[PDB]
């Protein structure tokens, strides 16, 4: 599913991401924009052979099992395929674990480089929520 900007912002808000671990909603929408362009089916293979899945490009090295990342962990206890669903639940719940792990949203290198320090509220402007 490719989400619209306000649609995703509403869906993330319904799933408990507004102010989660103190990150306003615009952080989460900005991160998804540059990670996936709001496409739940986005995948990309990393240099080391692991693969990132879904609207927030969650990595099989640490977070999910795709059966093809030898020696990796599955800290969200999900198949990576779960993260491609039109329903964002699995992605959201796994993102909550990730952002709770010590490094906050810096885990998303695109968030650090493109969203952090910026006017992230712009990302939810004009949306009804
Ligand atoms: Cl947009
Ligand atoms: Cl695994
Ligand atoms: Cl959803
Ligand atoms: Cl933090
Ligand atoms: Cl990253
Ligand atoms: Cl509300
Ligand atoms: Na894994």
DSSP notation for 54-113? TTTTEETTTS-B-S-STT---TT-SBGGGGGSSS-HHHHHHHHHHHTSSSGGGGSHHHHH
Annotated binding site: 101
Nearest-angstrom CA–CA distance, 126 and 123? 9
**70 burial via Cβ count (<10 Å: 0-12, 13-18, 19+):** exposed
Q: Specify the 3-state DSSP secondary structure of 36.
A: helix
Both tokens of 87, joined, read 């329903």
Which element (helix H / strand E) includes 27?
A: helix 25-36
Ligand 1 centroid–CA 98 distance in Å is: 24
Ligand 5 centroid–CA 110 distance in Å is: 6
Domain count, the chain: 1
Ligand 1 centroid–CA 97 distance in Å is: 26
Enclosing domain of residue 124: 1-129
The approach used to solve this structure was: X-ray
Resolution, in Å, please?
Answer: 1.9
Annotated binding site for substrate: 101
Active site residue 52: yes
Ligand 1 centroid–CA 72 distance in Å is: 33
Among residues 35, 48, 66, 119, which one is catalytic?
Answer: 35
Residue 20's beta-bridge partner residues? 23
Comparing CA positions, the residue from 53, 48, 52 lying closest to residue 70 is 48
Among residues 48, 52, 66, 119, which one is catalytic?
Answer: 52
CATH number of the domain that 100 lies in?
1.10.530.10
**β-pairing, 51-53 with 58-59?**
antiparallel
């Amino acid at each position: 599913k490719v989400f619209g900007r306000c649609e995703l912002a509403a869906a993330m808000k319904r799933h408990g991401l507004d102010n989660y671990r103190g990150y306003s909603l615009g952080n989460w929408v900005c991160a998804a924009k540059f990670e996936s362009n709001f496409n739940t089916q986005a995948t990309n293979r990393n240099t080391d052979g692991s693969t990132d899945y879904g609207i927030l490009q969650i990595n099989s090295r640490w977070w999910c099992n795709d059966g093809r990342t030898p020696g990796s962990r599955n800290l969200c206890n999900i198949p990576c395929s779960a993260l491609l669903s039109s329903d964002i639940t699995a992605s959201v719940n796994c993102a909550k674990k990730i952002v709770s792990d010590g490094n906050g949203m810096n885990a998303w290198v695109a968030w650090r480089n493109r969203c952090k320090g910026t006017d992230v509220q712009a990302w939810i402007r004009g949306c009804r929520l």
